[PDB]
Amino acid sequence: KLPGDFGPPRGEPIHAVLTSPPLVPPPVNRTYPAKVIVELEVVEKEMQISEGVSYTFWTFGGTVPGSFIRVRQGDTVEFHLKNHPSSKMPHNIDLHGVTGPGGGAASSFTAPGHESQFTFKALNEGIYVYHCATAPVGMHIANGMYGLILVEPPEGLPKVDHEYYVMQGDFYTAGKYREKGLQPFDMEKAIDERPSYVLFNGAEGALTGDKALHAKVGETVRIFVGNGGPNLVSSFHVIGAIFDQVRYEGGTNVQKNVQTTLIPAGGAAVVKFTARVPGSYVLVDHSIFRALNKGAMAILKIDGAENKLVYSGKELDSVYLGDRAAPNMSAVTKATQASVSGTLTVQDQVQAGRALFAGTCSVCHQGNGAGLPGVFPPLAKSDFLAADPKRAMNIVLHGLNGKIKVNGQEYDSVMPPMTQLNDDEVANILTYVLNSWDNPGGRVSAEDVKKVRAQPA
Amino acid sequence: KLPGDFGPPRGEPIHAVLTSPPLVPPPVNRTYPAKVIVELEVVEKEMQISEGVSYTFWTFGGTVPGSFIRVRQGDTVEFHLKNHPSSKMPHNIDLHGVTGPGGGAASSFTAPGHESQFTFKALNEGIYVYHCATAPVGMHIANGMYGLILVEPPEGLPKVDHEYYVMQGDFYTAGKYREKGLQPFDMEKAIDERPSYVLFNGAEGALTGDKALHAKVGETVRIFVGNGGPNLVSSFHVIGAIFDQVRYEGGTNVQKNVQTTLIPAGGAAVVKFTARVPGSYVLVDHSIFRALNKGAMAILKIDGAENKLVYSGKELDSVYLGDRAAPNMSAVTKATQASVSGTLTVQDQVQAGRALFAGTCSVCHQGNGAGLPGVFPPLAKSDFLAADPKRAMNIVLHGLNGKIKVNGQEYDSVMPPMTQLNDDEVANILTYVLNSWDNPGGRVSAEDVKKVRAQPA
Amino acid sequence: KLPGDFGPPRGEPIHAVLTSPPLVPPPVNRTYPAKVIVELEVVEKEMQISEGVSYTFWTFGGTVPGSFIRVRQGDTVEFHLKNHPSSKMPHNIDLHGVTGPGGGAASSFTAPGHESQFTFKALNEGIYVYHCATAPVGMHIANGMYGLILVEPPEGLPKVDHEYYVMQGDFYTAGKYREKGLQPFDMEKAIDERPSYVLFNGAEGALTGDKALHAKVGETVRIFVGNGGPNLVSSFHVIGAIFDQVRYEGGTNVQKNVQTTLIPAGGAAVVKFTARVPGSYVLVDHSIFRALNKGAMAILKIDGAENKLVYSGKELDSVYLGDRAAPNMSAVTKATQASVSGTLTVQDQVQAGRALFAGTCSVCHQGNGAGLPGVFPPLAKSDFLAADPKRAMNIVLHGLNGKIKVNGQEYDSVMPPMTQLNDDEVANILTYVLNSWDNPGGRVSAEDVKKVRAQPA
């Protein structure tokens, strides 16, 4: 006997309603097997992978991850793949959970402007990755061609207050992290498994700040978590909380009460969270340079009353979250576009630098630039800064140590180098500082910084 | 009390019969503990890691992975290691599952032309990796010195229709992937965990095409899956199917109904599959550049009747499998040897290029070179190709975009660069194309391509 | 209802007694919830990461990993973080297991010379990583800012004979492995997840030789195993044994009878071992170049009677353990310091080289330099060595093959290159050999080797 042996499809054919991340379709709420028609369209298009950083994504349904599909174990799924006429590449699909060679791949090969279809029975309950399976497959996956299909058990999943859709991926750009412009895919980095970005939902900040997930104290939250890869395994973790349950794919095993759990490349899990105290809870890859240096952070923000008996402390801030502990960094996008257009103003730079200063510089120098007398020197009304703006460029790029005097007080400490900041970022941060806190104004350009980087002091 | 406390050995001493991958010895089918004599001989020898790519493997029993050993929990194992006189290095063994320092290592040190022996009781049921433990250990493991030992539970494993033996490893050559010739081990790549090949059973294609594993619809298949490493963790997955069961080593835990599962470096698992519909099912490392760019794919081919109610679609093809969706690529081996001998003919190149064209080029240009009018230009009877063979070399290496005219029709699309193809591969593919489909014949040499690669247009 | 709902704190406030690795505080042995006051002080200081290799660690309590904290589920923990006045950086803490944003991070921000405090209820039993959460977070973690907190179940863990504390981390130095001197942190290696050292407890040899963990035949050993990362996932394994139990964090799942288990970055597990036969049992990351080329090995040494019915073989030696199968390598530290001081003697070099010869050279040439006639040539009273010391430098760096004659006998084999040895290591090893076994004495300097490395023969 095969699994999912619930008889022939009954009722009427159902046209599946698919959702865009981070949302999920409603529970199927059905006690009979059905014929479910799924229509998914591939679109190739530029989107912002980071502020001022464009990338040509290849998408299922216009998003990364692709549209979420929700069916019932025992359903017959008639799957239609369309490839938008604007596409340059052929595409196809392999749905994990399908019983059949390639998970659908051979019968879903679809050239630009064409459509394909195939039918499969969903024998297997579980959460499953789907992805493109077109040579070169790794390229297609790296460009964003992955999503999730949920095959519900016949009785449905237990009721929760919220369901969300979060999917990790590793990305490979020719340029370095936060280097502006349209970035090509980089095959060499991809083969070496050396991503420049590691993201949830296709972009830096996709699920931070004003794009956070939400719930309230006392509520339950289910998250369908995918790892599209192509290559990385996620040390998937929630900062400041625990997972009530973690279940991989359609596995019989359910782990309970864990905070950190390994999601294979191509894998998927369902996690459950119960909100207990208010604040921001961070989903990360705890291979932690991915989370805090490459973009792999997402936020579940919980509203409600503090409970001092459980936690006396404060909400997260830029010390931990960095520059993602603001609503957004739109000013960076604006400054980058103004640079391209040749219309970059001092204020454009100031606002971009303000965004970028948070965490990156404020951890030591404070959000108001005051520092801590004798420990961290001030950027506010800083004689040392004003005396030599080129020196300040060198300090950001190359660090500073040894005894200095700032505003009449001696410091004898170490500012590490910050060479990974791009020329525009250094320029904008320093322009912000110069135009704040009674400093002398003026500006630093990306070209100024490029020159200092090419010839350290 | 110790585990495996089944009393002294009884009956007669048993001389273990070991098997070469991908086969397994028969079930022990025994209700009493025995003295089991195991004899394993190390052989160092060149073998083909890929077509036309030689490597000096270090082996247990002449194969990678090494010979499979099958005993019963509670057995006393008298283990004899011989090192063939042709060896240059000393060798030894650490069997996971042994209770004792080094898993046998100190007492199994064996110089070329010598033999060692030690005795251990198999206290622990499970599937376990064994490997060489001779300084530099990572080098010995990277050269192929690993295999599996099964310690059966006293009652035996449940009956299945087929048992197979599959073992992943990461390999480190001085040359790049598919660069021909005898490739040395590369210590720097190994320390950095940057393999050039990631393989099942010691070679590209070891378990694809005419070397696939076989079963029939309705049958059960058990696979003993090892990960010799040295360094990688496998996101081990079956495309188009599910694992009924996954059990790691001798663990009490058994996961059921999962498709993707993480196998540690040095780890091993037993998986179970039930054949439901015909076609090819791909075992991969779903860190997917390993599978589709470095060789980490193996096939279980299922024969029997289609069931359109479960899967309406077609068997896998070269779009997904690439150039491994043919029986073999023997023509590549032949062309490489002819190059070495100085006897390379046009036909040698043609046949090699035919093999390599599959997936790599046919995904877009089709297996008959017809392309898709207005979308993918033809290689068949291509005026554009014929007009400038050197341009064609540049297109393969460096890509092509922008408006072109081919056979009277405009194209305005993107062919990505394929710079990872080696000079001989480009040469052979283009010679195949030139000698097909009414194209003008002639040939492209590896030296021609080398020159274009050194000076792009 | 919240987990850990055992009522208000009762009894007297308890001042937690924290322990330094590899030791653990006693079981809490308490049946009521308490207010537990924890005081932890950050200290930045140089320590030896390897012999003659200094590193500026950032520590919780002066050690890597940081002091171990032990409380009971349901306790109220008043956590005090002090930052020593000598610090240059601000610091804070995120304790996994805390219910609240950042695991404490925002409320524990502590500038040099300051103190912070916050209160949390331990709702969640389990073993948990704590770490610094100060921008740049990955830098702080990479510098050593991590440890473990145990939250006991209310009834306590089962009694065992020994409890130990072992924590893996990946480290990123500007210099290569075993390159001497004060090594800076290397941000580029860290972002790329390319560590130069992978260690247990903050140093090479921290838990080997005379610093091994101890137990006796018949005893049970519990190890609290952390993985601070920042980036690597451990294929955590015990050579020559098995884990009776493995439990991750506070998970309900317990795996039994496994030898190899994957610990996520930021993860923690409790393992249990039962000593059965005497000898050294090696805890490793079985991504095995980490263990045997980067330092990721620790020893549990078991004393007691051999049991030939279970294991007939010998204790581990330098073939497997390499140069860590001696009590210590103090002579390397001494030679390095003498070099710095300009007082390096021949004997200083000899003793350092003696330490380094073990495994590295003795595997083939034997500990007495005799080799194996006709198979491995002698270093003892070697005419070939004496005839050309510069040739010997080239042989170590670059290898040797082909027919040679040594002490009247022909060899025709292969000595692989050993280019990863540093100039001082080559110099000291060869000085040891030259001053042993009736060889002619004299010395080889690091400068001599530097010259040969820059111009191979």
Ligand code: HEC
């Ligand atoms: C702590 C880890 C710091 C971070 C992050 C940043 N800075 Fe810093 N900065 C720090 C110290 C301890 C010092 C003094 C070094 C010494 O030799 O004692 C500095 C110094 C500066 C200066 C010069 C002095 C002054 O004007 O106050 C500048 C202009 C400066 N720092 C700028 C700066 C910016 C823009 C940062 C983010 C990109 C930044 N710093 C981070 C400590 C730390």
Ligand code: HEC
């Ligand atoms: C799709 C992803 C492709 C793959 C894989 C390969 N080619 Fe291609 N090729 C493709 C396109 C869209 C184009 C036209 C680009 C444009 O500017 O519009 C091309 C073009 C060629 C040509 C030149 C035109 C012609 O003769 O038809 C050649 C000679 C060619 N391609 C060869 C070729 C070979 C040998 C391939 C495998 C190594 C290969 N292509 C792959 C799309 C794609």
Ligand code: HEC
């Ligand atoms: C086995 C894998 C070896 C290890 C490890 C080391 N050596 Fe070696 N060495 C080995 C062989 C097989 C040979 C002969 C090569 C041949 O062409 O047949 C050698 C040779 C030497 C020599 C020269 C000959 C002699 O004096 O005996 C020297 C000086 C030498 N080896 C030194 C040496 C040192 C110092 C090592 C550790 C750093 C070392 N060898 C390791 C095999 C192996």
Ligand SMILES: [Cu+2]
């Ligand atoms: Cu695609």
Ligand SMILES: [Cu+2]
């Ligand atoms: Cu897949």
Ligand SMILES: [Cu+2]
């Ligand atoms: Cu060996």
Ligand SMILES: [Cu+2]
């Ligand atoms: Cu091992």
Ligand SMILES: [Cu+2]
């Ligand atoms: Cu810190």
Ligand SMILES: [Cu+2]
């Ligand atoms: Cu953490």
